[PDB]
């Protein structure tokens, strides 16, 4: 089963439009950034808001959002299904329903 969260190169605006229509908190998607080629972005719905996070990379080639580092996007995503992607809000990743 291919992952339901990879949307490729979709505009930031299209991600917001799609996510605002989701009904559950945590609905998310990973997209290839248009403003920063080579980078990935994570867009998530929480409440009635849609937020964007940049997938950061370190000198060792690892992916991360804040502190915990991962070897792949897949691992970063799965970890955040039970660990908040936000420091001020409790936002756990949940697959888009479609």
């Amino acid at each position: 089963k291919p992952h339901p969260w990879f949307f490729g190169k979709i505009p930031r605006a299209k991600a917001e439009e799609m996510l605002s229509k989701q009904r559950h908190d945590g609905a998310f998607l990973i997209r290839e950034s248009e403003s920063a080629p080579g980078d990935f972005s994570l867009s998530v719905k929480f409440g009635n808001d849609v937020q964007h996070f940049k997938v950061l990379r370190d000198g060792a080639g690892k992916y991360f959002l804040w502190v915990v580092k991962f070897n792949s996007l897949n691992e970063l995503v799965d970890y955040h299904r039970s660990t908040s992607v936000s420091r001020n809000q409790q936002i756990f990743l949940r697959d888009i329903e479609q």
Binding site: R12, S35, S41, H52, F53, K54, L56, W66, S86
Partner: peptide
């Protein structure tokens, strides 16, 4: 430019 919750300007 675009803002991200985990990136400080």
């Amino acid at each position: 430019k675009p803002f991200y919750v985990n990136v400080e300007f």
